[PDB]
Amino acid sequence: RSPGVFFDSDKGKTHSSGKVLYNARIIPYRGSWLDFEFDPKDNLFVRID
Amino acid sequence: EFDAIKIALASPDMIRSWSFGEVKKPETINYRTFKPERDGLFCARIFGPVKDYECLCGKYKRLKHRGVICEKCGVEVTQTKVRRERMGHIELASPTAHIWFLKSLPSRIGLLLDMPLRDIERVLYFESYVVIEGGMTNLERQQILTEEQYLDALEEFGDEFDAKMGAEAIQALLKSMDLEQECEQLREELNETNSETKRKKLTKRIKLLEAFVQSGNKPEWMILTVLPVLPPDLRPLVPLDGGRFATSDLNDLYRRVINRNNRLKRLLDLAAPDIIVRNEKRMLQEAVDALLDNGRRGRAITGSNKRPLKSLADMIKGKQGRFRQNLLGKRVDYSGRSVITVGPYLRLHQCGLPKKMALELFKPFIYGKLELRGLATTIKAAKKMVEREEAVVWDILDEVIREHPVLLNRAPTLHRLGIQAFEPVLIEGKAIQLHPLVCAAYNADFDGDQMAVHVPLTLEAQLEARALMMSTNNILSPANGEPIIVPSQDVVLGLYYMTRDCVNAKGEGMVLTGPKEAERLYRSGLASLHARVKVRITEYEKDANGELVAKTSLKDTTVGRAILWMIVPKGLPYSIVNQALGKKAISKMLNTCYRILGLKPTVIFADQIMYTGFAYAARSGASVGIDDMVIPEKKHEIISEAEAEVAEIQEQFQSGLVTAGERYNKVIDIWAAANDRVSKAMMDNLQTETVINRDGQEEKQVSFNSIYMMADSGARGSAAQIRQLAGMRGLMAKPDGSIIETPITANFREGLNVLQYFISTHGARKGLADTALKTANSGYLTRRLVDVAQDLVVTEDDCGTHEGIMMTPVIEGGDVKEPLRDRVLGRVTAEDVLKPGTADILVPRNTLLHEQWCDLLEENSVDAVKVRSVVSCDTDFGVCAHCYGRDLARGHIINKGEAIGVIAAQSIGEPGTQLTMRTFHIGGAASRAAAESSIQVKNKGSIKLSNVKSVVNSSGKLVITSRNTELKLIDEFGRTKESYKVPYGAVLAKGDGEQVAGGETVANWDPHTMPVITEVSGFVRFTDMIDGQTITRQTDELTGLSSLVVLDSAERTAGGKDLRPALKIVDAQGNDVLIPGTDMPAQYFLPGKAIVQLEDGVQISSGDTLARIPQESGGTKDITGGLPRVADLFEARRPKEPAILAEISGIVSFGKETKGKRRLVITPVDGSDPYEEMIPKWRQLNVFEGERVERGDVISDGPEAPHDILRLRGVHAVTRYIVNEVQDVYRLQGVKINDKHIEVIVRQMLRKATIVNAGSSDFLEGEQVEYSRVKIANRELEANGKVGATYSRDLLGITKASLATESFISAASFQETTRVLTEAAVAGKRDELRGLKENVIVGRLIPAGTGYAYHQDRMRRR
Amino acid sequence: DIVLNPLGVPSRMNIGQILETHLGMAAKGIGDKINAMLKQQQEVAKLREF
Amino acid sequence: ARVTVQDAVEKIGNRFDLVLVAARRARQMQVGGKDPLVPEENDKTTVIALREIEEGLINNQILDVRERQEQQEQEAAEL
Amino acid sequence: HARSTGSYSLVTQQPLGGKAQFGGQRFGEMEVWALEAYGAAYTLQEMLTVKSDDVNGRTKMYKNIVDGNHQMEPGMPESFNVLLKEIRSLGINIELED
RNA sequence: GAUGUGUGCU
DNA sequence: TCTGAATCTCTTCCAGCACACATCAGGACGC
DNA sequence: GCGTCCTTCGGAAGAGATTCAGA
Ligand SMILES: [Mg+2]
Ligand SMILES: [Zn+2]
Ligand SMILES: [Zn+2]
């Protein structure tokens, strides 16, 4: 996977209701991950490493 | 020797009894002269001597000093074999927690003290204090105190009050616990409290306390005080090449644990500060945790290469544990392995071994006979003579190899026929020659696969291989009544080319006196093999009681069939070869030969078919050229028509008539229709386009094109492969199961573009990545199916009952997929069947109906036979022979004492794996049907529309408004003949009662987007539909019409989730309309993706469409994508929307209105009426406020859940539902599986039965116990004056029912070894070694087959 | 030299092996004609023309 | 000279008791000196046992009565 | 490849795996079901008790085969004793009754 | 003896 | 404010056999 | 040449623990 920013979807099988989430990934060449993602309650939660 | 295995907790006194010494130093072999250290993990004083019968320091050397213990080093001189039997132990300075009783989830410590897991792990890993002996303060006996809170408690209450921390505190908590007082207090709380969740928690804790107080265990033993070590011989440090040693995991873990323990003891001896000793206690606890069960904590420690090392649990659990790697299967001596070749000169009882493999296999036999004849003198001389391969050894090898059968075995042994016994025939080379007649059973193609040989050593093994596992006695597959030795791929082609006719020959109209002159003609070349002559044959018949009566006739046959008649055994009618013998034809011929004559004529005739197929296939020269696949001259017209129609679909969806998913559903429809048209057109052009003259004008015959021969005979091929060789290749599927929108338009005979090849790459990769990555979840199915049915074995001759499932021939939407004959054959009837000569019985009550009886039932046109099922048997720990039927491999009733659970599980579990490693054979084609949307009835008769709620349309014709309908066509006799499933919102051109003529159309609909319809017309008001909040509304400005799409529960607003879209019907005055029959309003709810193209308050007619919802009917529908359904059925998954049933009978009416959602109360007219139910507003109710409902009727619609159907409609209904669904799933791919195996699995489902009321039994109220135990207890009580205990059958999945088996060794070996072993140690269980896997692990005669008599003797002897 | 099995052509759809067989037969026929014309020594004109 | 045991199974209809009784007979014939009732044709003891089964002049009943008689006569021979 | 009596493993008394080592084929977990299915119990008992696993019966059967006496005397598989010892290494007490 | 890679048949 | 239903979170599982090659085993620091 | 030592990344499902809501 090329280093950069990736906007994954995680469509479907989560939450058992079809509610599509949205998670943003910043993969570095060397360092720590900076995963942004949403929540079923429409909250935007960051998660590093 | 022994007859039980007991599992329980280990006491420190008991561990010291196991202990033979005290290891206290982490010193392995000293990196020097390789001697064990003084007090290390390896030591002769602690465990035992290194070399046999030798002291460590060297004070004694031979057996004449056995028993004494040396003085200088204190070691005993004894056997060196005892290094794997004599355990050591460690005296820990501080106690530690055993994780298996801490993190099992359910955590035993967690629910034993009713304090949560988090508090316990914080206490045991030193993050907070805990309270013991609260005493005269406000602190409770289980309160959690942090560091600051503990400091406060000491500065204010530094009295005799104590508050420990860590493993010592938990040990005090467990030691100071009184089991009886807690048990009676919890009993009082259970009797008092009415809530159900706290009731379940309390009864779980009561179960745990009862398990403790029943056995000899005590709660304080669950905290480790002494840690036994594994014997050194089971953790060897093998001396590698050089000075280094092996990096054995257990040695490193024990070194770390001993390091922590010794350092902690040293610090405790020097009175270290409390924080340092607390940290070191934490280190000791985590080290012991990593040693016991590594990886269950947050981080798994590693020694080198950053790889999670294995502890004492990774080698007991999992795929690489001892149970699955070294107990249920072991590497085996006297075995070999080589690539196989054909050698078609063999017979069914013969194989071909290489001359060099047999010398290494049968080496002890050669040694024995060389010593017997005196040609050698000692063992080593014979060894040298064999290694020098003298001429005498080769002579005597032919003596031992004579009639000593071996086990030919392939690597994937899917079913019972994976191991067959053959006699060996010594040949040169290095290849294992295999008889091709069993290669279809083996699934052993000759493309480089390796088979494995095995040598029965003992006498009984050879006799079992001769009488049971011999390939001669294995000509009937256990899956069904069809034979498994079917000629294929050369013999079928040879026979089909021989048994065929064309109108010309060297001699055609001549007459012959028998087969011999036909052979003379064909060998001399004076008459072709496809002549049409009239020979004089003598076919035999056995109308008498076993005597063959002669007859001679003059039949009009070919030369080839006359030649073939020479090998047919005396006794079969001639009307079996007088046709074009394909593959199914000769399969039926072999089947009827077995049914009529027997076994020896059948095997001799099979060998003769082999020979006469190979010879006349070699002589045929049925080659294949590039001029044999003929391209039809009208396929491009079909692709042009399909292109025009899909171009129409383009305008259809871009305008807005259909959406993207609907466009995708219709484009696959039209492409599949075009593919099916091209295939049929090419097939006709390739099978009939031939011209020949009969000495006059031209005449048409069945074509002699080579491809047609090998596609019609069925030797190897089908419609798919040849269809893709000429004409249309079709449309392929992606690995996820979706189908490509564009089918490539070309064939392999003309070529492919550089882009159509890229598109076909999708299907080509789909096939391979489907095989290699989804045969895993089909081998898992057969693994956990063999697991759940291993302990089921026939045990009795007859259970003697009248219960039995009801058997009907099924017609589920087409013609008769399977008739009565194929369905009831070889199963004992349950009661006197009534023929339609009523008041008289046709077949007796307990006769195993064979083929003659099947013909008799077919003659009298019987449609309803009550047959005995294996699920309704009444025996204990097994099933009687009469409730099963025939052996399905032999032509007789099954023999008592045969493991049918294994043959049932394997038969169910290896069409899936086999066919999922076959989807790449056809390439990558989707093979999806055309999804017909019309009803073309063919047979003549009347209609019986059962459970149909139809309404009148604006055109006046009937429209169905029900989901569980089925249109059955019944002929003039009244017997059932046809049955079609009409869908929701379908219009009918006919009805019920009218005699429908054969060949008309009665029902029409639209395949995609089944529409919701209305009963009563009027104006519709857009209720609870505001644009944006719950509906996406798009409108064209010029015209001004609304064509909206509703949202799901997914993309809708969170606040607006309580808003539910629906269409309400109102009149001109806006008043409430009513459903015909009731006074409730017409509230038609709308599901997701519902499109509406109307306006509020428009005038419509009764019985019209209102909205459309896409179906997304997309998928390749192969066995790869299409069999998670079998897993769902067998593990009994609750469906997403279960259709609610009527749990009790009586009148139906509502009670309270909107207790959050709708409510309904069922009240009987005589009994009590305490039943209420909660109805979410999602599903409309098919019943109203004023009808009578019975037990099992569907209140709403949807798939049935395989729990309520059992608990309401009984065992027979749920077993029939499971059987029918699995049978339809398997028959969708052409597989033929006998239903007995599925019924066996369903019976294995029903072993648990919760108690309703205690009655006079000793079982508790809500305890779940084996159904066999309940039945035995009730039968024993009924013999006395007491009353039996009422129960109810539960239905747990195969995994759930296997994990809760009474014999804990089976569950421990299968899955979740930690969670099962911990439960068995807590409960103090005692295994009886009753099933098959338990005796396999122990290593005894399994009570399954030949060892069943020995097991009976051993059981009845005590 | 080798007697293969015809049924390995249709069921596994490797039709290209038949075309390779035909083209190899044509190639070996041309080679056989060249070998024949070279066996009895003819002038370079005929070989070049062929 | 043996291809299948269908006739033997027709003699004793268990298909499993047959294996045990044939094993007992062949064990009697091999390690001991008991002579076969059917003249062998250079065959392994298993098929001599099976051939004794198929001609009908042996079964479990015959074997255990013969063994009981042999035990009685050998214990009476001590006198 | 073929294998008579030969080398054996160390932690469990079973034949080695491979061809470079003189090792035999594996009658695996799926293989045993194909023998329980037939009901051929005695041959299965030789394939996992006396031919591979145990130590005393392994030599006794070899002597019986080169003595003219085809008979098997099963003991206990050593791999089951290994399982018993590895379970007793934990806090669990598994044992054999009388 | 265990890991890593490649490969054959399903 | 107690108590079921829904949701969050933790754990288990993922085909069989065989063959070939490689490394690897404390490796860091003091002597 | 010896010798002694203190990364993340699956996904389908089941179960046991929380939160919610709701009457
Ligand atoms: Mg293959
Ligand atoms: Zn000594
Ligand atoms: Zn029965």
UniProtKB/Swiss-Prot annotation, chain A:
Note the coiled coil stretches, chain numbering: none
- State its role: DNA-dependent RNA polymerase catalyzes the transcription of DNA into RNA using the four ribonucleoside triphosphates as substrates.
Subunit note: The RNAP catalytic core consists of 2 alpha, 1 beta, 1 beta' and 1 omega subunit. When a sigma factor is associated with the core the holoenzyme is formed, which can initiate transcription.
Spell out the family assignment given in the record's similarity comment: Belongs to the RNA polymerase beta chain family.
What protein name does the entry list?
A: DNA-directed RNA polymerase subunit beta
Source organism of this protein record:
Escherichia coli O157:H7
Lineage of the species this protein comes from: Bacteria, Pseudomonadati, Pseudomonadota, Gammaproteobacteria, Enterobacterales
Placed within the complete protein, the shown segment runs: 151 to 199 of 1342
Swiss-Prot record, chain C:
Please, which domain of life does this record's source organism belong to?
Bacteria
On assembly, the entry states: The RNAP catalytic core consists of 2 alpha, 1 beta, 1 beta' and 1 omega subunit. When a sigma factor is associated with the core the holoenzyme is formed, which can initiate transcription.
Job description of the protein: DNA-dependent RNA polymerase catalyzes the transcription of DNA into RNA using the four ribonucleoside triphosphates as substrates.
What protein family is recorded? Answer: Belongs to the RNA polymerase beta chain family.
Protein name, as recorded: DNA-directed RNA polymerase subunit beta
The root-end lineage is: Bacteria, Pseudomonadati, Pseudomonadota, Gammaproteobacteria, Enterobacterales
Curated annotation (Swiss-Prot), chain D:
Its recorded reaction(s) are: RNA(n) + a ribonucleoside 5'-triphosphate = RNA(n+1) + diphosphate
Molecular-function GO terms, alphabetical: DNA binding; DNA-directed RNA polymerase activity
Q: Does the keyword Transcription apply?
A: yes
Record EC number: 2.7.7.6
Q: How does it assemble?
A: The RNAP catalytic core consists of 2 alpha, 1 beta, 1 beta' and 1 omega subunit. When a sigma factor is associated with the core the holoenzyme is formed, which can initiate transcription.
PANTHER family annotated for this entry?
DNA-DIRECTED RNA POLYMERASE SUBUNIT OMEGA
Query: Which HAMAP family does this UniProt record tie to the protein?
Result: RNApol_bact_RpoZ
Q: What does this protein do?
A: Promotes RNA polymerase assembly. Latches the N- and C-terminal regions of the beta' subunit thereby facilitating its interaction with the beta and alpha subunits.
Q: NCBIfam families, from UniProt? A: rpoZ (TIGR00690)
The family line of this record is: Belongs to the RNA polymerase subunit omega family.
The name this protein carries in UniProt is: DNA-directed RNA polymerase subunit omega
- Give the organism the record lists: Escherichia coli O157:H7
Its organism's taxonomic lineage begins at: Bacteria, Pseudomonadati, Pseudomonadota, Gammaproteobacteria, Enterobacterales
State the gene name recorded for this protein. rpoZ
